[PDB]
Design a protein around this ligand. Structure first.
Ligand SMILES: N[C@@H](CCCC[B-](O)(O)O)C(=O)O
Ligand SMILES: N[C@@H](CCCC[B-](O)(O)O)C(=O)O
Ligand SMILES: N[C@@H](CCCC[B-](O)(O)O)C(=O)O
Ligand SMILES: [Mn+2]
Ligand SMILES: [Mn+2]
Ligand SMILES: [Mn+2]
Ligand SMILES: [Mn+2]
Ligand SMILES: [Mn+2]
Ligand SMILES: [Mn+2]
Ligand SMILES: [Zn+2]
Ligand SMILES: [Zn+2]
Ligand SMILES: [Zn+2]
Lengths: 313, 313, 313
């Protein structure tokens, strides 16, 4: 049985648009807990993390809201480590992707051997010195990579941080809008990725075959899936802050997660960037939330071929 | 030359929404017969089967409109067997999918060795005892499987029925909304299927390669294609009663049928569930009918690469 | 470095709808030159070819506006040969596809060994005698094939033409609406093609693998990509004269061009059939132009995985 630990993370200061803090809210009213229970899932809600409001938080060079972001992740890391200590798969219903710093950090405290699968249209690996926007939701991966220690300056709010994963312990899926410096980092650190080009060339089937073999190569290990809603095409998840055309389809999104589930190794999940206030209509919001939910349910057993209990129907 | 036998089947009592009885009507006004003739097709219209209105037809346990459904299929089976006896491929322009009982039954009377390819978002294999909706359009396959005889109670209107095919003589393509008991039946009877997950993993090319090799393995045999319009994504065929997101694309729909045609073994075809009254706009109806037609034409020779007659152009 | 030679070709008399002459205009205001420069591209604008208005130009049999079309291509051929003589990749921002006659002709004058990749929903290989519409945008390939010399009557405005390529030097990608005589020509001349059926069967990855191996088989050679905007599905490029459902996706469009770029052999490019006046709304025009631009940028280095300069970021 897959036991989950729900963690509402209503945070938005990793990027400019505030509606993203409502993600936990709309996903819960969409019936996420109920539907997960409608499956043979053991669900425990740790609630929406009451985030600290930091009024005095000026930029660090170009970096915006560092103390607010650094604190929210520090907080989140503690909780995540708590649910992991409780033998449950952490399900972070987030706001912006900057929270990945706290989510993966807390996860690694309990399972330092985790591997990460990052589904996103972006690499989110800009450093405080390579970022041109200054938004932290596009920098989480740089704070977590060991090889990048010595290239990240002491940013206010992140002294508690300590790189927990190596460049070879992560795989990207869905990339289509990578900045120049981010690309240089990819090639230089030798990070394994499958941009939309490789998805097109190989097919999501082979893509998943290779991703799992790449991470679970020398040994089985806990899997951390950080899912950025904008990894999927804007025709499926339009209500998000940084949409990019030519994305992963609904089917590929479910295929990705269905394959992850089947490994039996999922231990950490991030459902991020759903911003209901960014839908052009009421149904664009509904379409985004529903897709987000569907992807979540797939991570915990829901299969398109069907499901049945150990009884004689 | 591919000789066809058109059979209008204006029936809806297999499910709650009545607009589906108009399928034959809108498909004929869409120019189906004309377009089939525009190809080297020998077309004979057997007309719209005048269906018997059965006012006294209370539920059997949970099963709704059994006598009306059982009669419509009994009628349809007779006709289908008639066109098959006339050396023509039966083309059933239907209403709801419950009619498959009569279509496949009549087909098998003349060609007891047929194989069936079922394109649907659903398995339609619920038994009168496993169904939770009581709608017969989601139960046709259970009445046709020999291995399930002894699990189907005597339902009013179906005494004429006799299971004609084995679980290994059928292949599903497109599945994405299967009930628990239906899943148990799949696994227990060992039915071969390609849910949307296998389509995503392998590609429609391999999917068709395997389906045809699976059915025409030990020997060539007549092929029965029961096509449920909801097997395709609702972005292509929105005007249908039970739409499910993440469906087969327009291209995959045509690929499926193009490959079937090329075998030269198609002998029975079902174009079901088009319900014009369920389109949200006039063009959603137009989009559904046009796709339905396109799929039909592909089954009888129309190829995307082009077509030409045995003359020197 | 990839040096480009921009050639505006505001022409429409190859087909009935005139808005296509605005293609160069809207593509330039979309920032095409600027964006190409934003890449390490050496860009030179040769301007919009002022096309000769030919008031006296009655049909030749069924062929409409032959002298206007024949002249526009004769003009274009001269320019194209000029930029090629200047060591630059010719970028023809066109109107209708009839201009391919002049584009490929001028290209071949300088590189008689070129290979052509034709992305289109159509083969555009009708002869003045096989065409049923009389529109020249659906006949350009017939004027360029050597094997067809003796089957093309002396059409006013094309005496300057001389077939420059053989049937085995061209590959089609995207076909889904081919006329009977066009099909006969395909099979008879043995032209290599990948209709939407082969794309569906093999995947765009294998399709590109085979196309490039087919053309650059016995030796590397200059590549001419004639891209008809209607090769992509109308959901991506709706503002075009002859749209056909079930087309190439946005992703496949970019994959095609990304692979072409990587060969380092692109020497001639045609971005044709964008007709802003045919968009049902302001955004359908915007969607078409943006896709057109994106495809253009991919042909010159823009990659979805990212790009970075030879410096230490
Ligand atoms: N690369 C851009 C956009 C990053 C997008 C962040 B994400 O993936 O969390 O939405 C930036 O650094 O500002
Ligand atoms: N499984 C559901 C829905 C079946 C849908 C039937 B069909 O495929 O014909 O639309 C039921 O038994 O009611
Ligand atoms: N085959 C049709 C349509 C050709 C379409 C031309 B094209 O590809 O340039 O849009 C004709 O000959 O008129
Ligand atoms: Mn993103
Ligand atoms: Mn992200
Ligand atoms: Mn169905
Ligand atoms: Mn059905
Ligand atoms: Mn075309
Ligand atoms: Mn064309
Ligand atoms: Zn973000
Ligand atoms: Zn139905
Ligand atoms: Zn055209």
């Amino acid at each position: 049985s897959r036991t989950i630990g729900i963690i509402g993370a209503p945070f938005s200061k990793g990027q400019p648009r505030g509606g993203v803090e409502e993600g936990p809210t709309v996903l819960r009213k969409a019936g996420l807990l109920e539907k997960l229970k409608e499956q043979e899932c053991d669900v425990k809600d740790y609630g929406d993390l009451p985030f600290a409001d930091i009024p005095n938080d000026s930029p660090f060079q170009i970096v915006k809201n560092p103390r607010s972001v650094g604190k929210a992740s520090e907080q989140l890391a503690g909780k995540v480590a708590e649910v992991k200590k409780n033998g449950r798969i952490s399900l972070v219903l987030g706001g912006d992707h900057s929270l990945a710093i706290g989510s993966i950090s807390g996860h690694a405290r309990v399972h330092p051997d985790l591997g990460v699968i990052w589904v996103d249209a972006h690499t989110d690996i800009n450093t405080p010195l390579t970022t041109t926007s200054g938004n932290l939701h596009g920098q989480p991966v740089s704070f977590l990579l060991k090889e990048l220690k010595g290239k990240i300056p002491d940013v206010p709010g992140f002294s508690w941080v300590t790189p927990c994963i190596s460049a070879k312990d992560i795989v990207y899926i869905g990339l289509r809008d990578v900045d120049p410096g981010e690309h240089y980092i990819l090639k230089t650190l030798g990070i394994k990725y499958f941009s939309m080009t490789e998805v097109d060339r190989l097919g999501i089937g082979k893509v998943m075959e290779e991703t799992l073999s790449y991470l679970l190569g020398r040994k089985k290990r806990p899997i951390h899936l950080s899912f950025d809603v904008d990894g999927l095409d804007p025709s499926f998840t339009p209500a998000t802050g940084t949409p990019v055309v030519g994305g992963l389809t609904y089917r590929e999104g479910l295929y990705i997660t269905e394959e992850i589930y089947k490994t039996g190794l999922l231990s950490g999940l991030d459902i991020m960037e759903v911003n209901p206030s960014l839908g052009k209509t009421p149904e664009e919001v509904t379409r985004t939330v529903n897709t987000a939910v569907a992807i979540t349910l797939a991570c915990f057993g829901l299969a398109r071929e069907g499901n049945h209990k150990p009884i004689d129907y």
